[PDB]
Short mmCIF file of C-alpha atoms and ligand atoms in Angstrom, two decimals:
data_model
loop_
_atom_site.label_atom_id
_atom_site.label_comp_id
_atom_site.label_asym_id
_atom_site.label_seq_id
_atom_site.Cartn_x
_atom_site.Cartn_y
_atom_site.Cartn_z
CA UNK J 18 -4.02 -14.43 13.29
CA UNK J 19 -6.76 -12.14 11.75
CA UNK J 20 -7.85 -13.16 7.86
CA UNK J 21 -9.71 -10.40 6.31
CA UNK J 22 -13.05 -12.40 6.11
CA UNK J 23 -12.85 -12.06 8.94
CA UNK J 24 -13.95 -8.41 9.21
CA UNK J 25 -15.84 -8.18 6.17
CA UNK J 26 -19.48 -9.87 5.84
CA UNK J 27 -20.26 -12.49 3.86
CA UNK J 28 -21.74 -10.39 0.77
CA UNK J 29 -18.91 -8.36 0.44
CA UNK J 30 -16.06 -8.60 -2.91
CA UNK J 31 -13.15 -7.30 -2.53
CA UNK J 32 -10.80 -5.09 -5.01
CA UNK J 33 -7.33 -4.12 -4.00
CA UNK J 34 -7.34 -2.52 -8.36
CA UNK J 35 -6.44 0.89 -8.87
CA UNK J 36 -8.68 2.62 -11.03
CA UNK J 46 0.22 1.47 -15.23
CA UNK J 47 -2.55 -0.57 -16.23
CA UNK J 48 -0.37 -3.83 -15.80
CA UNK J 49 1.13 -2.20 -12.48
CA UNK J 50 -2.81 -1.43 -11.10
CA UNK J 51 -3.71 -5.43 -12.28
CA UNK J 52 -0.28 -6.93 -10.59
CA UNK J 53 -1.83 -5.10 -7.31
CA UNK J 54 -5.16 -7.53 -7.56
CA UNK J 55 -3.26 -9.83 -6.28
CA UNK J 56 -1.74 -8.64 -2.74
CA UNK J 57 -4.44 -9.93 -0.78
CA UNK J 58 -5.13 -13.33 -1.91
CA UNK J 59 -3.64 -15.61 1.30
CA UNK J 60 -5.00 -13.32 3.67
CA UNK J 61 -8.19 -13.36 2.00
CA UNK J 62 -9.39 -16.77 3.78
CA UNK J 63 -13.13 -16.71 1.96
CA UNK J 64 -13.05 -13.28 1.06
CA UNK J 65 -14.07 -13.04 -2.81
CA UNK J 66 -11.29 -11.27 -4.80
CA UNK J 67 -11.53 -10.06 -7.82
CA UNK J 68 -7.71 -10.77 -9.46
CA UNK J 69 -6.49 -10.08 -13.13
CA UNK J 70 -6.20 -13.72 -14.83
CA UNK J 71 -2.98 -13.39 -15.38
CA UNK J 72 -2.60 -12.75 -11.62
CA UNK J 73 -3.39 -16.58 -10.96
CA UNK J 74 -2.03 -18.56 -13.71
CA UNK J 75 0.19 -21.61 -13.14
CA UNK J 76 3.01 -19.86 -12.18
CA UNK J 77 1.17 -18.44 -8.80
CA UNK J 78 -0.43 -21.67 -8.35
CA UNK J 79 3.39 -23.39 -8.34
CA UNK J 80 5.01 -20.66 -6.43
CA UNK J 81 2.06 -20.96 -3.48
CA UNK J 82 2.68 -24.90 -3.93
CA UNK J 83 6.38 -24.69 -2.52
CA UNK J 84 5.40 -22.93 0.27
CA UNK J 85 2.47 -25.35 1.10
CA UNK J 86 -0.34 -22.46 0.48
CA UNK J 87 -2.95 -23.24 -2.35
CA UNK J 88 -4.25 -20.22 -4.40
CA UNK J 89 -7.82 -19.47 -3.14
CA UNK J 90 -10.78 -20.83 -5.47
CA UNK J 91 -13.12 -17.66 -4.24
CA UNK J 92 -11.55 -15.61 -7.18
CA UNK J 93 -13.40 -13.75 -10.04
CA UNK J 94 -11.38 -13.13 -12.85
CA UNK J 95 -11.57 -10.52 -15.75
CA UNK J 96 -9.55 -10.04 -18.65
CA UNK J 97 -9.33 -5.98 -19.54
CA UNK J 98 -11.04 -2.65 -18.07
CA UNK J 99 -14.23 -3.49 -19.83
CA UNK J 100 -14.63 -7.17 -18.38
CA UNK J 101 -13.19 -5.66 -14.99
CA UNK J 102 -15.90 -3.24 -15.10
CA UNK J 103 -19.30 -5.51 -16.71
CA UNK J 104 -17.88 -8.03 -13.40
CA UNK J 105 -18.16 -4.88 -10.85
CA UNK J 106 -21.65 -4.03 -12.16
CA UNK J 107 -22.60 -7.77 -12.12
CA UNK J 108 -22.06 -8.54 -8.92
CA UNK J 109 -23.54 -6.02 -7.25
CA UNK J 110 -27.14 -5.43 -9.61
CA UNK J 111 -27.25 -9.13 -10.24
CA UNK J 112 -25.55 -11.20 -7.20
CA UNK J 113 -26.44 -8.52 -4.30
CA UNK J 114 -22.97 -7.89 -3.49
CA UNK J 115 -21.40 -5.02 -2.00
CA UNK J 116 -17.95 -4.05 -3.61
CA UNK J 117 -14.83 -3.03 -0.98
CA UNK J 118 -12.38 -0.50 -2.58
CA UNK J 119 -9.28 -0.24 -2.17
CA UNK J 120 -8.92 2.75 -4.42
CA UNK J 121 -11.47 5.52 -5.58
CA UNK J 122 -13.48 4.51 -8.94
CA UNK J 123 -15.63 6.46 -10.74
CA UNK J 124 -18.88 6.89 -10.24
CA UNK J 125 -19.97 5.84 -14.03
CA UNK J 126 -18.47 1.81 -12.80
CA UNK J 127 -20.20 1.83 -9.56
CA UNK J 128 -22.71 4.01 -7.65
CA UNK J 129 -22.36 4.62 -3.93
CA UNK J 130 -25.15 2.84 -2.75
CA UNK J 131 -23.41 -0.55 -3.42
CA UNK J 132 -19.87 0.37 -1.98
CA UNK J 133 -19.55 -1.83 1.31
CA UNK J 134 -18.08 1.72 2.77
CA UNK J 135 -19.32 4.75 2.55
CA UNK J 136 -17.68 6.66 -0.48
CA UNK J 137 -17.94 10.25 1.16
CA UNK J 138 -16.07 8.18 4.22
CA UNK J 139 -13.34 7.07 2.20
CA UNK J 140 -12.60 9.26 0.73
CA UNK J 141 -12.44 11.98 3.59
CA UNK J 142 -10.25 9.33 5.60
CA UNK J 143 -7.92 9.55 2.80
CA UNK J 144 -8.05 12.89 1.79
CA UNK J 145 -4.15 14.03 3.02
CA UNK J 146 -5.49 17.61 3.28
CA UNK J 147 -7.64 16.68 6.12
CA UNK J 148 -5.18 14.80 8.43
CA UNK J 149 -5.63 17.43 11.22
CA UNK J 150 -9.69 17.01 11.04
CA UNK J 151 -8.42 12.76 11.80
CA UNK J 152 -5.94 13.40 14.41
CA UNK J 153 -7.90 16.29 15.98
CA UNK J 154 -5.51 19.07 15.39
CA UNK J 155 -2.32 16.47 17.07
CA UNK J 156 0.83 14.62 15.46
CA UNK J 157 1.39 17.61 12.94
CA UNK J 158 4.38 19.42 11.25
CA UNK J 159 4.62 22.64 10.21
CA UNK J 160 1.95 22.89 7.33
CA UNK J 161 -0.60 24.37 5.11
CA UNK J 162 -3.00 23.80 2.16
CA UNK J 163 -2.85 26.79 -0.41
CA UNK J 164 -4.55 27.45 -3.58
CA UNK J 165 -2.30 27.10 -6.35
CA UNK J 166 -2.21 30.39 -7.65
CA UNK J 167 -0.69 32.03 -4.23
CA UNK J 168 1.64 28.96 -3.93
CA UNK J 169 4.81 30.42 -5.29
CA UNK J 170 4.61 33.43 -3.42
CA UNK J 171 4.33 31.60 0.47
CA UNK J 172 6.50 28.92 -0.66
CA UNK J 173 9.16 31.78 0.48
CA UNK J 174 8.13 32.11 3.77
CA UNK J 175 9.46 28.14 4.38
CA UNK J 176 12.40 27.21 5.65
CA UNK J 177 14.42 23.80 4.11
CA UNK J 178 13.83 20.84 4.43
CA UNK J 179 10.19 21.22 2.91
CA UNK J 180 7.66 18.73 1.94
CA UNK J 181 4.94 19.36 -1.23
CA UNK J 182 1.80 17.31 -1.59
CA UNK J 183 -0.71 17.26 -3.66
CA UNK J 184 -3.84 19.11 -1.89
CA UNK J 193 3.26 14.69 -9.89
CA UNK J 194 3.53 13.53 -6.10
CA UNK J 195 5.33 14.20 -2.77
CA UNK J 196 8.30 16.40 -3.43
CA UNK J 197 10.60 16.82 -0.47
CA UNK J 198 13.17 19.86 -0.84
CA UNK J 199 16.24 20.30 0.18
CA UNK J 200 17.07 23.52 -1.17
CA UNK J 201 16.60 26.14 -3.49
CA UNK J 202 17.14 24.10 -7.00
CA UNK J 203 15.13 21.05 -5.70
CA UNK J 204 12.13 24.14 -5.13
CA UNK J 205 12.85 25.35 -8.48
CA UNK J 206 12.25 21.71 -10.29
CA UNK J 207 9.17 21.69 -7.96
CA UNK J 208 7.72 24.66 -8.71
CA UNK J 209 8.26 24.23 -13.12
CA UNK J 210 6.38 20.45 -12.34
CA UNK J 211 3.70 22.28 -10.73
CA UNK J 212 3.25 24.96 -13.44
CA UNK J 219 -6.30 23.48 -7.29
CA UNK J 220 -4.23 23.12 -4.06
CA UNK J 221 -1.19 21.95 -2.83
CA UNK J 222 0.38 20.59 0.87
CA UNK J 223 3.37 22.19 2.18
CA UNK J 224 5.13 20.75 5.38
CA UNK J 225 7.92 21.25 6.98
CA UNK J 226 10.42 17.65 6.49
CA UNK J 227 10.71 16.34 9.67
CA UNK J 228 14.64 14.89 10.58
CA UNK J 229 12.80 11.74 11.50
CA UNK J 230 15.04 8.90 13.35
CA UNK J 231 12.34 6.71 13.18
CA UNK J 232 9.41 5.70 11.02
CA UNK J 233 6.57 3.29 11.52
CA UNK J 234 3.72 1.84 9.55
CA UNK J 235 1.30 1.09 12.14
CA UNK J 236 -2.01 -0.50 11.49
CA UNK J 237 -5.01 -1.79 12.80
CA UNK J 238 -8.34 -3.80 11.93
CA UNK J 239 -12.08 -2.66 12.82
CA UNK J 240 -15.19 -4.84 12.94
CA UNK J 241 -18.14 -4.55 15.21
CA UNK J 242 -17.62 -7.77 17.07
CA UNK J 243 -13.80 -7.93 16.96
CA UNK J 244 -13.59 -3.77 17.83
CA UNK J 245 -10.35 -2.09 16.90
CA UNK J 246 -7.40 -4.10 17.04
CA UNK J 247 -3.73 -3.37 16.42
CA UNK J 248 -1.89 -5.60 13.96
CA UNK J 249 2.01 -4.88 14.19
CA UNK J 250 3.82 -2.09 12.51
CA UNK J 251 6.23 -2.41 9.76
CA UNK J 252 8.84 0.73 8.97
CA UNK J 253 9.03 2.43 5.90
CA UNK J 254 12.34 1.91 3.68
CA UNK J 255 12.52 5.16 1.90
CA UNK J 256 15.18 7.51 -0.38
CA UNK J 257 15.67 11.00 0.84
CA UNK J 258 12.76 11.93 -1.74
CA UNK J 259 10.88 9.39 0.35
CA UNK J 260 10.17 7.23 -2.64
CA UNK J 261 9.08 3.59 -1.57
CA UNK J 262 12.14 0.98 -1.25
CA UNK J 263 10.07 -1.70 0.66
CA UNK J 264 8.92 -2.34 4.52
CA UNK J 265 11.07 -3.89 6.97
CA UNK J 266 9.24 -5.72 9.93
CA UNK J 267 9.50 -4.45 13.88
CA UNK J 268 8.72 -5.05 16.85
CA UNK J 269 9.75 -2.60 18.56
CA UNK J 270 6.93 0.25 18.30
CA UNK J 271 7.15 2.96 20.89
CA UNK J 272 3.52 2.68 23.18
CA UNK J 273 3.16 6.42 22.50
CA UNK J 274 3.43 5.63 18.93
CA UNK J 275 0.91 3.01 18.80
CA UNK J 276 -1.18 4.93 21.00
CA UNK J 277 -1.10 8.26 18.43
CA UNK J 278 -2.48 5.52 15.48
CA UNK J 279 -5.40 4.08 18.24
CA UNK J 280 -6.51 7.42 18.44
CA UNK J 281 -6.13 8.25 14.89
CA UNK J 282 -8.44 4.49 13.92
CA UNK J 283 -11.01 5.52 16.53
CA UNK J 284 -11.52 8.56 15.16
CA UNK J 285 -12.33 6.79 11.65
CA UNK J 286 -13.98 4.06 13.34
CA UNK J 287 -16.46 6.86 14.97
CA UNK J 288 -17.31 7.83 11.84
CA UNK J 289 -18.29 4.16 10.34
CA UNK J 290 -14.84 3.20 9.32
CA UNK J 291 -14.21 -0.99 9.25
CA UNK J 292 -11.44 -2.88 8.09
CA UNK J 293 -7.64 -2.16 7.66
CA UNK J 294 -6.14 0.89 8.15
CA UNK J 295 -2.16 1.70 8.31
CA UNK J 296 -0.77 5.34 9.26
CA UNK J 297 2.90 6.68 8.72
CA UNK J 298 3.90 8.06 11.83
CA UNK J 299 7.40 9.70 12.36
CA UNK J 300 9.35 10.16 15.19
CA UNK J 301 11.84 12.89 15.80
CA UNK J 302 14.73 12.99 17.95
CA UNK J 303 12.71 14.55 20.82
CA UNK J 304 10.02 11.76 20.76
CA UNK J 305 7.34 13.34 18.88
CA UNK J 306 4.99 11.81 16.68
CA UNK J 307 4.36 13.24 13.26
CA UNK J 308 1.23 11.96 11.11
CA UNK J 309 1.99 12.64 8.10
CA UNK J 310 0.39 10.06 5.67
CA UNK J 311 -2.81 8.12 6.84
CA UNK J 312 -4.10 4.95 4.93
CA UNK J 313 -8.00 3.82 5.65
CA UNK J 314 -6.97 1.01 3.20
CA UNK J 315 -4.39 -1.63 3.45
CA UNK J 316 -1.17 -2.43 1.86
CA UNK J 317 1.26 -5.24 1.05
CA UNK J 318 2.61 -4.62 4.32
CA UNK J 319 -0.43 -6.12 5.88
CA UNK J 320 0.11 -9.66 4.81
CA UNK J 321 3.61 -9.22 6.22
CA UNK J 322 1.83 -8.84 9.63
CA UNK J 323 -0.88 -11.52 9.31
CA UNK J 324 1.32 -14.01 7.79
CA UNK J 325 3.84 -13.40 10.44
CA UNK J 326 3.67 -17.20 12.07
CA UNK J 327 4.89 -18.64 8.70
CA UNK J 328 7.72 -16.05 8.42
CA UNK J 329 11.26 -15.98 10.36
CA UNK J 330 10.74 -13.15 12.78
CA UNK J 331 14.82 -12.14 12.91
CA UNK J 332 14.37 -9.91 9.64
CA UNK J 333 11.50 -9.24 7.19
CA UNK J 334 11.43 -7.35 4.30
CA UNK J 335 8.02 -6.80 2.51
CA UNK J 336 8.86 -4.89 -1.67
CA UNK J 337 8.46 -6.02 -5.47
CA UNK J 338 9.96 -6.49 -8.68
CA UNK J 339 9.64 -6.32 -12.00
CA UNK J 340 11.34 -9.00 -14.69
CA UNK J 341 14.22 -7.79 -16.74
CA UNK J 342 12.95 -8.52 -19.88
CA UNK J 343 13.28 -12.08 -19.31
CA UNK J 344 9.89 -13.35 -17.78
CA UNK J 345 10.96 -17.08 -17.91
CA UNK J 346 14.78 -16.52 -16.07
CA UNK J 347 12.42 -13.77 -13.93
CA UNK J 348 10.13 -16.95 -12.76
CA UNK J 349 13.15 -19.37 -12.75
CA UNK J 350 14.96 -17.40 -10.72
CA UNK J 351 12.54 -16.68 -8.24
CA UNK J 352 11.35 -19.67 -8.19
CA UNK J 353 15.17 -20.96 -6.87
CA UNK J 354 15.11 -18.70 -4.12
CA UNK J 355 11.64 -19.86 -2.59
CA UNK J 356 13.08 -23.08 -2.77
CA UNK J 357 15.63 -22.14 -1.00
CA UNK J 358 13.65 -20.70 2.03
CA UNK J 359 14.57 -17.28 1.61
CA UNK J 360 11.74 -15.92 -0.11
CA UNK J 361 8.01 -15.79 0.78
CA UNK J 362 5.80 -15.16 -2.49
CA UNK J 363 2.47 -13.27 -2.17
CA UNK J 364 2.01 -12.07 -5.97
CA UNK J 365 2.74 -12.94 -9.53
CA UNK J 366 1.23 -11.17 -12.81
CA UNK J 367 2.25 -13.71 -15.50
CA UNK J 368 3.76 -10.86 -18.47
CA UNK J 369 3.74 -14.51 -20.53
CA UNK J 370 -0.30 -14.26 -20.20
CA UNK J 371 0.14 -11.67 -22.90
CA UNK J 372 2.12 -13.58 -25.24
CA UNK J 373 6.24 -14.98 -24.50
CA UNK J 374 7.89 -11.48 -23.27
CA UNK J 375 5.40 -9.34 -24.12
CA UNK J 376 4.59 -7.64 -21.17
CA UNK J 377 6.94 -7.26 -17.88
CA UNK J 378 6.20 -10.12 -15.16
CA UNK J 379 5.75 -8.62 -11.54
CA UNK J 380 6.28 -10.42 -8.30
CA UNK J 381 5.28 -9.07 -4.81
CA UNK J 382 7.06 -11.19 -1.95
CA UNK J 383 8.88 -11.39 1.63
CA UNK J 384 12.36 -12.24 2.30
CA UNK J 385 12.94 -13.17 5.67
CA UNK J 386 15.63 -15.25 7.55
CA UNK J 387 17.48 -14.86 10.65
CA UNK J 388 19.21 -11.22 10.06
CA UNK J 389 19.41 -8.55 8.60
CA UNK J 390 22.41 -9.43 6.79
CA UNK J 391 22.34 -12.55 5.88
CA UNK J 392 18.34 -11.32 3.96
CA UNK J 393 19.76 -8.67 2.15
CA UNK J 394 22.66 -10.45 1.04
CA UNK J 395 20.45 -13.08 -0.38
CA UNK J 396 18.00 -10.36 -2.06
CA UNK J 397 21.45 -8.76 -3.72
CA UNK J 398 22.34 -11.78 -4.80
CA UNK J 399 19.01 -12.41 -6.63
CA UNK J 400 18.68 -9.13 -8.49
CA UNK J 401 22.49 -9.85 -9.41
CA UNK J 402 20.94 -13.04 -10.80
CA UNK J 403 18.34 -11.08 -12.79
CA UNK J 404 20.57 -8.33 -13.92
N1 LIG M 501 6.68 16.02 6.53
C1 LIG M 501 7.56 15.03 6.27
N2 LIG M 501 8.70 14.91 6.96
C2 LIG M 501 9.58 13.93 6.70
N3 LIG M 501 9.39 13.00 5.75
C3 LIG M 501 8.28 13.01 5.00
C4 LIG M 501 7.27 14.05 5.21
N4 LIG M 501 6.27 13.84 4.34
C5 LIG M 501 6.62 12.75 3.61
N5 LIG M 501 7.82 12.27 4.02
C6 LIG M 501 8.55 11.11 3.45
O1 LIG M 501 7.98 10.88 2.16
C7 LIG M 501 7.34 9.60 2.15
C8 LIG M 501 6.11 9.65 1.26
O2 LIG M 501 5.24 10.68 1.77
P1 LIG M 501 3.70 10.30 2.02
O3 LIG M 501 3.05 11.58 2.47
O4 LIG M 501 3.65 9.10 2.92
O5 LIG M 501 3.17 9.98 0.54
P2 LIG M 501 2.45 8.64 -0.02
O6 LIG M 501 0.99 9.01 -0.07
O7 LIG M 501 3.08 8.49 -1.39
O8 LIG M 501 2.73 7.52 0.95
C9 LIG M 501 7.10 9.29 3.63
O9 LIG M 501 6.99 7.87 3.87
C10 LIG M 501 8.31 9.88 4.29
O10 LIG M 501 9.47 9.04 4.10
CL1 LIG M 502 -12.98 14.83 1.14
MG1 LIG M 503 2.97 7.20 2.94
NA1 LIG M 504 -2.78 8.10 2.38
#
């Protein structure tokens, strides 16, 4: 299976940091065993002991091409560092300001990136195919056309998604919003996918599984399950949708939410020229037990020992894959919340989400 140094060139360091402070440095983290020799610049205490034992268990070692920093300033003097003073070019994962970095030692093109990501522009990506209902409108006339919708109704940022069922979820909508905003029409989906793919010159575009979204009926993030059972016309719609961002200089790992409706059709109604935890689900997949996956985080309770303790049991166990770990203890016993990004897989679908019950029992 694909490792991400795979598709990037050897001058290239890689940060998966939003630009939560303790939420954006547990997220340094996701890529590290996919990495391979990838450079990755983590949080320190993203790789403390505690990641080094939990990797142990499952026979993985944590990768010594790491550069750590400590805070935003030592995050940012590293940035600047490596690419004035070691010729490297710097792979976001998330837009930074221009003040840290200027474009001309991004490994991708920031006008790119961001115009792959830009959710207003999904139509320009799929070439006008895969779409809802929707519009972009200027704030100020919002509240008037909002009334020309019909329920369900999706709004996006042009807060985050709101999806409305009716006229007092609009009304809670509208006093949050109070330049331009995305409204959509919520499509009765029976089906979601996560469906992603890799670029590189000499490897060209290829497609790395598909995980499904867990979501609430607000569509907030509960975790991915794995699948292999992606429709060919679904696939297809995301092939068409990477070529069209590999046309315009695109490389690396891109994932798009596609729905499906009862009829068949494909909705795109998030795309995602970046990669997620999902990915290592996908790339890891020959160390995993294909009957269920299911990709999500957690935070500790308070507790950061009993939080390491306890998830520490479970890997034992089998159950539980570990990716992440931001050590809260880094900061001083229980001063700051441990995190822990992970996989629990087994033969079904029952018997993994009995044992991931069972653990956050355990915690709570
Ligand atoms: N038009 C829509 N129809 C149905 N569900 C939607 C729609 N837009 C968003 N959702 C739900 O909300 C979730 C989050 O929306 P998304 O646009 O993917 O935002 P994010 O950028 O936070 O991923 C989706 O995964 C899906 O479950
Ligand atoms: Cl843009
Ligand atoms: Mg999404
Ligand atoms: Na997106």
């Amino acid at each position: 299976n694909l490792t991400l140094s795979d598709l990037y060139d050897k001058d290239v360091v890689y940060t998966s940091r939003p630009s939560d402070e303790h939420q954006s440095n547990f997220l340094t983290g996701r890529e590290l065993l996919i990495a391979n020799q990838l450079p990755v610049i983590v949080h320190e205490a993203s790789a403390t002991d505690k990641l080094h034992q939990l990797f142990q268990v499952i026979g993985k070692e944590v990768p010594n091409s790491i550069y750590t920093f400590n805070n935003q300033q030592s995050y940012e003097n590293l940035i600047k560092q490596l690419a004035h003073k070691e010729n490297k070019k710097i792979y976001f994962q998330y837009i930074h300001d221009e003040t840290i970095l200027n474009q001309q030692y991004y490994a991708l093109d920031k006008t790119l990136f961001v115009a792959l990501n830009n959710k207003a522009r999904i139509p320009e990506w799929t070439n006008g195919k895969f779409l809802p209902k929707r519009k972009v409108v200027k704030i100020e006339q919002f509240e008037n056309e909002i009334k020309n919708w019909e329920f369900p109704l999706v709004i996006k940022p042009g807060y985050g998604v709101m999806i409305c069922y009716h006229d007092a979820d609009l009304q809670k909508a509208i006093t949050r919003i109070k330049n331009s905003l995305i409204i959509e029409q919520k499509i009765e989906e029976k089906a979601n996918y996560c469906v992603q793919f890799a670029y590189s010159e000499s490897l060209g575009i290829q497609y790395l599984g598909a995980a499904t979204q867990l979501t609430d009926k607000y569509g907030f993030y509960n975790g991915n399950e794995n699948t292999t059972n992606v429709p060919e016309h679904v696939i297809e719609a995301g092939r068409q949708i990477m070529e069209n961002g590999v046309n315009q200089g695109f490389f690396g790992v891109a994932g798009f939410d596609l729905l499906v409706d009862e009829d068949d059709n494909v909705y795109a109604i998030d795309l995602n020229f970046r990669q997620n935890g999902s990915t290592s689900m996908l790339l890891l997949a020959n160390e995993l037990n294909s009957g269920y996956q299911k990709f999500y985080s957690y935070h500790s309770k308070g507790d950061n020992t009993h939080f390491f303790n306890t998830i520490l049991k479970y890997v034992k166990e089998g159950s539980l894959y570990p990716l992440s770990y931001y050590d809260g203890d880094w900061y001083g016993e229980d001063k700051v919340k441990s995190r822990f990004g992970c996989i629990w897989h087994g033969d079904s679908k029952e018997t993994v989400l009995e044992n991931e019950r069972a653990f956050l029992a355990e915690l709570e």
